[PDB]
């Protein structure tokens with residue numbers, strides 16, 4: 341059953357691996373590991389370098405863990421490595437950002453397309469259903485690309501006078517602020533900014549402030565600096581993800597599969613939910 345052996349290891353593998361976002365994800369992973377009695381391990385690529393993250397995942401596969409929960413920095417570039425891990429007998433699920441062409445057993449995380457629709461439902465009314473919205477996001481990551489597509493589809497169906505400007509945040513807060521600054525310079529009709537991920541939630545408001553433009557801004561994630569800007573009204577809100585539950589249930593699924601406790605293959609998708617954070621509930625999200 342669920343009496344674990346501490347020599348059995350389960351790895352969480354990330355990108356942008358030092359940011360606080362992963363501390364909440366790993367807290368859930370480790371809490372489940374401790375409840376079962378196995379050992380949770382953490383590592384990742386420190387930036388968004390794709391070949392870098394492939395190498396990190398290879399270093400993990402070489403330690404022969406029982407299971408790996410990985411968030412893929414690119415939608416397809418980790419698929420062969422994931423498939424290799426599974427061929428070597430390691431259980432693999434994806435959390436937070438999927439590798440949907442790989443053989444991973446399950447995805448656990450935000451419903452990213454739906455969250456982009458929810459973001460558009462929030463932001464479009466605030467700009468009175470007209471004008472251009474800058475969408476600042478990590479090109480190549482499945483979760484960011486799906487959030488963008490949900491936002492874009494919602495506007496196409498429900499706000500015909502709204503148009504989008506896509507802006508790469510490049511996984512780098514300095515480059516992201518420069519790229520949004522350039523977008524604002526060239527597009528006088530921008531009225532709002534959707535920061536699609538945590539990098540953009542930091543860089544976006546910074547670029548907006550430096551432009552001195554009065555824009556509607558929806559951040560992503562719950563960095564204290566972002567929450568403080570919701571509380572002051574500098575930005576209009578942010579989007580909180582179920583970080584802890586991504587980690588907790590990734591560990592439970594990995595251990596279940598690795599020990600053959602379920603007669604069927606794992607269920608394919610756990611929706612860990614989003615909450616729109618405004619002044620009304622921002623206090624709940626401080627550490």
Ligand SMILES: OC[C@H]1O[C@@H](O)[C@H](O)[C@@H](O)[C@@H]1O
Pocket residue numbers: 355356361411436437478483536537538539540560561
């Ligand atoms: O940009 C930093 C982080 O922001 C989050 O919104 C995404 O879910 C993560 O995949 C990403 O690593």
